[PDB]
Amino acid sequence: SEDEGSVLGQGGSGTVIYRARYQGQPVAVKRFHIKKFADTMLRHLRATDAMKNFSEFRQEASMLHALQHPCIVALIGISIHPLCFALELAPLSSLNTVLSENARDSSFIPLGHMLTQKIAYQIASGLAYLHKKNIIFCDLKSDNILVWSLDVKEHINIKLSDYGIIVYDEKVDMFSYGMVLYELLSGQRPALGHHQLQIAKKLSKGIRPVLGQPEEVQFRRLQALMMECWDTKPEKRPLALSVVSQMKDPTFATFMYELCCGKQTAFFSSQGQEYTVVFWDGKEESRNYTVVNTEKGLMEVQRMCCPGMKVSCQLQVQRSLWTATEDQKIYIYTLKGMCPLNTPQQALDTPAVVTCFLAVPVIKKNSYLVLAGLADGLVAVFPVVRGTPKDSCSYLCSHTANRSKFSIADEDARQNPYPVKAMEVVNSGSEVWYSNGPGLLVIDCASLEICRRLEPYMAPSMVTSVVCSSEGRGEEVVWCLDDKANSLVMYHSTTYQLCARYFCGVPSPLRDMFPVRPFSQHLQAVKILAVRDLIWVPRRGGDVIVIGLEKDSGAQRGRVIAVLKARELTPHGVLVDAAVVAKDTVVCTFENENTEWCLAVWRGWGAREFDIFYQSYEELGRL
Amino acid sequence: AYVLALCRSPSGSRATGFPDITFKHLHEISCKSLEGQEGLRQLIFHVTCSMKDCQRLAGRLIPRSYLSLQEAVLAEQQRRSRDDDVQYLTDRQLEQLVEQTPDNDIKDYEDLQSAISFLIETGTLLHFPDTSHGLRNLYFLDPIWLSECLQRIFNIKGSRSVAKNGVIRAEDLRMLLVGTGFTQQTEEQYFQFLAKFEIALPVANDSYLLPHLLPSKPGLDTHGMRHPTANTIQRVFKMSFVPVGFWQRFIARMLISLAEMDLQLFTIYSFTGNQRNRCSTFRVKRNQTIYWQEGLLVTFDGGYLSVESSDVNWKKKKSGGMKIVCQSEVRDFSAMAFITDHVNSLIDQWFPALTATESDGTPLMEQYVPCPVCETAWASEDVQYFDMEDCVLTAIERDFISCPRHPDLPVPLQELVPELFMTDFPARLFLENSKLEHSEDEGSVLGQGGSGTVIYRARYQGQPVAVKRFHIKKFADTMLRHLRATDAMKNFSEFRQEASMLHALQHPCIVALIGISIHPLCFALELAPLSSLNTVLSENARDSSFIPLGHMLTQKIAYQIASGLAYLHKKNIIFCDLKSDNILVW
């Protein structure tokens, strides 16, 4: 159909691409219109134009038939009467269309994080394929990048056409790729003006439509690739094939940005109602804190005064922040005072300094129990009703439990008053597991008596982290991390039986894997971070190894899905801590020789997202 | 007033399904003092003389030939009564009495037909209009003789050595019944008659089943045949009353239907949009059968179905009723739809009065389905259940109905009433709604069938398709919900029947089936590019004398039509509506 409403686009040849149907398939038919209204000159001009159009026909047919890639619009056939040929028709129209539609209602990354990365990868792959074929685009733009799927699990989402809806080289196409990246990330055109000569002069003078910062775009690696792509010196601009290689790095996939607060004294991570990523500085009169909100990359609270003693942790309990100070006291403030919580609402005494916390919810009571892991291996139980703390404690003695049930020798090294470090809830909060030295102790949340002892490690070892996760089959499973051994061990929660070991001190975790029955410091583990159905294990070297389980005849094979490290985090020193701040966000905190702390935030991906990433690369490699 | 409250609508009009009863149809009498008997006599005379036929019924003008035939048949009845003869007037014998009539103006059959109507509505002739297999060709003279014969057959309480679980050999029945006929010259008529009344149904080529002689519940393990499987569907019927002989006739009908299915799986059929029905959706190979006066179990390859009388007391509404449970490891629950159609057919034929409600709109029968979620929660008690009317009303719109006792625990309909979701046929034959560019526009109408359903032009997977969609709704009220559920159930029965007959056939000259869908209830056939044979035939007929299509083309079209008819006849499928409009061109 030649109707004006059937017009799908126009090319630079003066030819028109219409919407049509071929064999019931929706097709984009480029037709050539040659006639321009007995005369000799008319016949001559007509034959000349027809000859030129036929030359263009042959050239386009040759270049279309010669190419086959996943991200190029394929050719259906070629016809003589009329002189036209059919290409695949994009169901979703151009990249520009949907990009504008999603740009209207967002700030950055209108298409979504994973989708934006995949589209950038596909464009880079197409450009690399053309460059391998020694084919130069010279007119790369959002109007001629056509869309076929807006899904993230789908293999192909876009293809590049020869039509839209002086000296050229791969660096020019990469400059245009940088502009396409700008449009992808921002959703807005590079509006440097209305006159293209002045836009070109501005671009040549290094002027660019600068967007926000990594805290705001939250996809810093793409921003670095972008800025490197439009470098005013073409010799420095990347190669498209190099970009295709780079995109396969999971660090690009998951790292968002980093934020530095300068000098502090300690770091803690909370649930995120407030003090989401808190750093503590000062002491006594000058004691203060700085809070980072990871979803915005902002410091709404900066060195806000909070007088008192040095704190090891601060448990947020439905409104009330329980500051474990070194004076064997928990100072309980509340959010009613907003940020400057200088006056505590309660002060609860302990026989030893509180080293860690846990808040186990009793749903049958609609209440909480704050279990404070003390400096001597004993557990202080403080009931909580609607954020109101109680002074009537229950102190649980590890030594009494050992004398009662576990019967460890009084001469054993396990008798040391080792401080409680790790605390976790298992069995829908029916039991609380906490680490004491090489061992672990399980408190019954109904009677609050220390019910079980597990031995993930043997003396003189020490467990520093304990986190519970559940496989997709409903098997609830608990990791236990050790400092001396530099290894983690996995138990079944419903049997209290050791079932796997994962050694972390691996200099080269090349597809590192271990079974599951039915520079030396740089490899030292930091913390267990249970994210969705995977476990992130940060290490002192700045790299975090993410592991999942593969099913094998009922048994499991724990295996790394990806190794993650943003090299740009090197100046901030050794990785000290880490946390899971949201279901789809993870943080890891470095400290340097100046005691200056930095926060590096990663997309809290699970098995689904890592699998989609790696599977996309493997599958597109196979196409 | 009470007897009107039992028969009148709350509005004061006649309630649905009930006669037109008023104060003018009420009376009371005594037999000793004869109080009010004169009043009743006067009322009878008033209503009879007030009876309009057309003129008034009492004294209406009727041909003297019809009256002469009336006296003739009365004389024939008297003759046979004197002769101790059998009271069947065959079609030939009635025609002979017509021929013997003096001054007979009856010359073609329709005049006789009107006369027959007269003879029936004056109590002269008795008729059972069963047109199947020519069984209609018989008329009755004496109600007393009829009742006597039916009581004589009912009277035969043969021992288990005689009644082999309710069946007696044909020769034994023929011998036992001699005294009021049942000779070799009348055996065929008598067995035709008993089959019409469903008194002695044929059994193999050996015996006849007498439904009042069904055995008691045999000492067999009917519970050990049950499986602890998730592929379990249950239905429960509650009934205000149980008709006498309900279970006997009901069970006998399933028995004979299973027998004929077993025979065919090794003769009334239908094609095209037609009122005629058949259990073509039932294709099951039986393995064992147990049956008794008040129930039956059938065990087939892949599962079983049980029906049994039960003390149904949902919502403390204890009354008559029954339970049905069907299990099938292949998700084939066509046996339950088979039983559903049998329930409907039995009630419509023999207890159609039960297809109604109370004077206030309360159904005489109700159907419920035990709730899988509530049963799982309990697993007795008044466990929850879903009204069948709500089930069907929800299946047509939504994949889901909420559970009353567990509002936030989903019950799937397909795990509730799979017969309304087609768990029988392979999934490959499903029609994808996302791939169908269906349109209901008046310009998209490709045709209409006899089912009241509309065939539209649409696109499926880019292919031009003829999608037959069913339109069920006809604009809080109880009667509305009831009528709606009934129509949806009937439309789903037609859906299953058409799907079965379409999937079962593959010939060059039959329109093939692309797939079948539930939401909306519709299915796709191939769409003819050249429209109907009638269209192009008229177009080419305008400009020719004979053979508009061309010699060879005309011969080929005739051959193709003959081939299609031959294929259908080999399949024992009858067209009955062959015409140019439904022969489509490609």
| DSSP string for residues in A530-545 | EETTEEEEEBTTS-EE
Q: What angle do CA A528, A534, A540 make, to 5 degrees?
A: 35
Please give the residue of chain A at the shortest CA–CA distance from B460: A24
Q: How many residues does chain A have?
A: 623
Q: What angle do CA A512, A516, A517 make, to 5 degrees?
A: 155
Please give the residue of chain B at the shortest CA–CA distance from A26: B462
Give first-to-last CA distance, chain B, whole Å: 68
| DSSP three-state, residue A426 | strand
Enumerate residues 6+ apart whose C-beta is below 8 A from A349. Answer: A328, A329
Q: Answer yes or no: A173 catalytic.
A: no
Q: Per the annotation, does B164 bind a ligand? A: no
| DSSP three-state, residue A463 | strand
C-alpha B545/C-alpha A553 separation (Å) is: 79
- A418 with A462: CB under 8 angstroms? yes
How large is the angle between the packed helices B64-83 and B91-100, nearest 10 degrees? 120
Tokens of A245: 């290689």
C-alpha B472/C-alpha B453 separation (Å) is: 9
C-alpha B179/C-alpha B84 separation (Å) is: 10
| DSSP three-state, residue B233 | strand
Q: Per the annotation, does B537 bind a ligand? A: no
**How would you classify residue A310: left for phi > 0, otherwise alpha for psi between -120 and 50, otherwise beta?**
beta
Cβ of A25 and B463 within 8 Å? no
Nearest Cα residue to A271 out of A363, A387, A358, A336: A358
DSSP B300-317: ETTEEEEEEE----GGG-
- B234 with B537: CB under 8 angstroms? no
- A588 with A602: CB under 8 angstroms? yes
Nearest Cα residue to A541 out of A556, A526, A557, A559: A526
- B287 to chain A, any CB pair closer than 8 A? The answer is no
Please tell me whether the peptide bond between B228 and the residue prior to it is cis, using omega within 30 degrees of 0: no
C-alpha B372/C-alpha A448 separation (Å) is: 39
C-alpha A546/C-alpha A133 separation (Å) is: 38
Specify the pairing of strand A596-603 against strand A255-263.
Answer: antiparallel
- A342 with A390: CB under 8 angstroms? no
Q: Which helix (H) or strand (E) holds A552?
A: strand A544-552
* Residues of chain A contacting B461 with CB distance shorter than 8 Å: 24
Dmax (CA) for chain B in angstroms is: 91
C-alpha B365/C-alpha B486 separation (Å) is: 13
Catalytic residue among A139, A249, A533, A611: A139
**How would you classify residue A476: left for phi > 0, otherwise alpha for psi between -120 and 50, otherwise beta?**
beta
Q: For residue A269, give Cα distances in angstroms to A78, A578, B515.
A: 63, 8, 57
How large is the angle between the packed helices B334-350 and B478-503, nearest 10 degrees? 120
DSSP B413-469: STTT-GGGTT-SS-GGGBPPGGGB-----GGGEEEE-TTS-EEEEEEETTEEEEEEE
Q: What angle do CA A124, A128, A130 make, to 5 degrees?
A: 120
Q: Per the annotation, does B446 bind a ligand? A: yes
- Provide the shortest C-alpha distance from residue B244 to chain A (in Å): 56
| DSSP three-state, residue A198 | helix
Selected residues 437-476 of chain B with any CB under 8 Å from a CB in chain A: 461-463
* Residues of chain A contacting B463 with CB distance shorter than 8 Å: 24
| DSSP three-state, residue B354 | helix
- Provide the shortest C-alpha distance from residue A148 to chain B (in Å): 16
Q: Per the annotation, does B486 bind a ligand? A: no
- A123 with A145: CB under 8 angstroms? yes
C-alpha A567/C-alpha A569 separation (Å) is: 5
Please give the residue of chain B at the shortest CA–CA distance from A23: B462
C-alpha B335/C-alpha B418 separation (Å) is: 11
Enumerate residues 6+ apart whose C-beta is below 8 A from B308. Answer: B294, B295, B296, B322, B323
How large is the angle between the packed helices B246-265 and B334-350, nearest 10 degrees? 130
Please give the residue of chain B at the shortest CA–CA distance from A21: B462
C-alpha A2/C-alpha A30 separation (Å) is: 11
**Beta-strand runs (E) in B205-343:** 207-209, 232-239, 286-292, 295-300, 303-309, 320-328
- Provide the shortest C-alpha distance from residue B459 to chain A (in Å): 9
CA dihedral B542, B544, B545, B546 (to 10 degrees): -110
- How many Cβ atoms sit within 10 Å of the Cβ of residue A290? 20
Enumerate residues 6+ apart whose C-beta is below 8 A from B29. Answer: B35, B36, B37, B39, B40
Q: Per the annotation, does B452 bind a ligand? A: yes
List residues of chain A with CB under 8 Å from any CB of chain B.
Answer: 24-25
Q: Which residue has the tokens 């009528």?
A: B483
Q: Per the annotation, does B447 bind a ligand? A: yes
Q: How many CA atoms lie within 13 A of B386 on its CB side?
A: 29
Q: How many residues does chain B have?
A: 586
- A284 with A265: CB under 8 angstroms? no
- A550 with A559: CB under 8 angstroms? yes
Q: Per the annotation, does B54 bind a ligand? A: no
Q: Is residue A326 packed enough to be buried (19+ CB in 10 Å), middle (13-18) or exposed (0-12)?
A: middle
DSSP A78-108: EETTTTEEEEEPPTT-BHHHHHHHHHTT-SS
Q: Which residue has the tokens 């400059």?
A: A175
Q: For residue A2, give Cα distances in angstroms to A22, A30, A129.
A: 15, 11, 34
DSSP classification of residue A415: G
3-state secondary structure B325-340: EEEECCCCCHHHHHHH
Cβ of B463 and A24 within 8 Å? yes
Q: Which helix (H) or strand (E) holds B538?
A: helix B533-541
Q: For residue A475, give Cα distances in angstroms to A228, A555, A580.
A: 47, 12, 21
C-alpha A98/C-alpha A145 separation (Å) is: 11
**Beta-strand runs (E) in B154-209:** 167-169, 201-203, 207-209
C-alpha B329/C-alpha B347 separation (Å) is: 31
* Residues of chain A contacting B462 with CB distance shorter than 8 Å: 24-25
- How many Cβ atoms sit within 10 Å of the Cβ of residue A301? 19
DSSP classification of residue A6: G
Q: Per the annotation, does B219 bind a ligand? A: no
Tokens of B252: 């006998």
B69, amino acid identity? L
DSSP classification of residue A238: P
* Residues of chain B contacting A25 with CB distance shorter than 8 Å: 462
Please give the residue of chain A at the shortest CA–CA distance from B464: A24
C-alpha A330/C-alpha A326 separation (Å) is: 9
C-alpha A162/C-alpha A12 separation (Å) is: 9
* Residues of chain A contacting B437 with CB distance shorter than 8 Å: none
Q: What is the resolution of this structure in A?
A: 4.6
- Provide the shortest C-alpha distance from residue A24 to chain B (in Å): 5
Q: Which residues of A are annotated as a binding site for ATP?
A: 8-16, 30
Nearest Cα residue to B469 out of B511, B429, B519, B427: B519
Tokens of A593: 């020789």
C-alpha B265/C-alpha B253 separation (Å) is: 18
Nearest Cα residue to B277 out of B452, B495, B130: B495
The torsion angles phi and psi of A181, rounded to 5 degrees, stand at -65, -40
- How many Cβ atoms sit within 10 Å of the Cβ of residue A170? 21
C-alpha A541/C-alpha A564 separation (Å) is: 11
* Helices (H) then strands (E): counts for chain B: 15, 19
Q: Which residue has the tokens 């046929």?
A: B425
Q: Is residue A128 packed enough to be buried (19+ CB in 10 Å), middle (13-18) or exposed (0-12)?
A: buried
Dmax (CA) for chain A in angstroms is: 118
C-alpha A444/C-alpha A451 separation (Å) is: 6
* Residues of chain B contacting A22 with CB distance shorter than 8 Å: none
C-alpha B495/C-alpha B523 separation (Å) is: 9
Q: For residue A161, give Cα distances in angstroms to A10, A28, A139, A534.
A: 11, 11, 11, 40
Q: Which helix (H) or strand (E) holds A177?
A: helix A170-186
Q: Which residue has the tokens 């011998």?
A: B175
Q: Which helix (H) or strand (E) holds B119?
A: helix B109-121
DSSP B517-536: ETTTTEEEEEPPTT-BHHHH
DSSP classification of residue B515: E
Please give the residue of chain B at the shortest CA–CA distance from A22: B462
- Provide the shortest C-alpha distance from residue A105 to chain B (in Å): 28
C-alpha B57/C-alpha B469 separation (Å) is: 47
Catalytic residue among B53, B206, B301, B577: B577
Q: Which residue has the tokens 């209204």?
A: A37
Sheet holding B513-517, edge to edge: B445-448, B454-460, B463-469, B522-526, B513-517
Cβ of A25 and B462 within 8 Å? yes
C-alpha A143/C-alpha A90 separation (Å) is: 12
* Residues of chain B contacting A24 with CB distance shorter than 8 Å: 461-463
- Provide the shortest C-alpha distance from residue B458 to chain A (in Å): 13
* Residues of chain A contacting B526 with CB distance shorter than 8 Å: none
C-alpha B511/C-alpha B533 separation (Å) is: 14
The torsion angles phi and psi of A234, rounded to 5 degrees, stand at -60, -25
Please give the residue of chain B at the shortest CA–CA distance from A24: B462
- Provide the shortest C-alpha distance from residue B466 to chain A (in Å): 16
Specify the pairing of strand A476-482 against strand B232-239.
Answer: unpaired
Q: Report how this structure was experimentally obtained.
A: cryo-EM
The torsion angles phi and psi of B338, rounded to 5 degrees, stand at -60, -45
Nearest Cα residue to B234 out of B290, B308, B296, B163: B308
- Residue B252 CA to its chain's centroid (Å): 15
| DSSP three-state, residue A499 | strand
* Residues of chain A contacting B434 with CB distance shorter than 8 Å: none
Q: For residue B405, give Cα distances in angstroms to B31, B387, B399.
A: 58, 14, 19
C-alpha A263/C-alpha A280 separation (Å) is: 10
How large is the angle between the packed helices A170-186 and A240-247, nearest 10 degrees? 40
Strand partners, B305: B298, B326
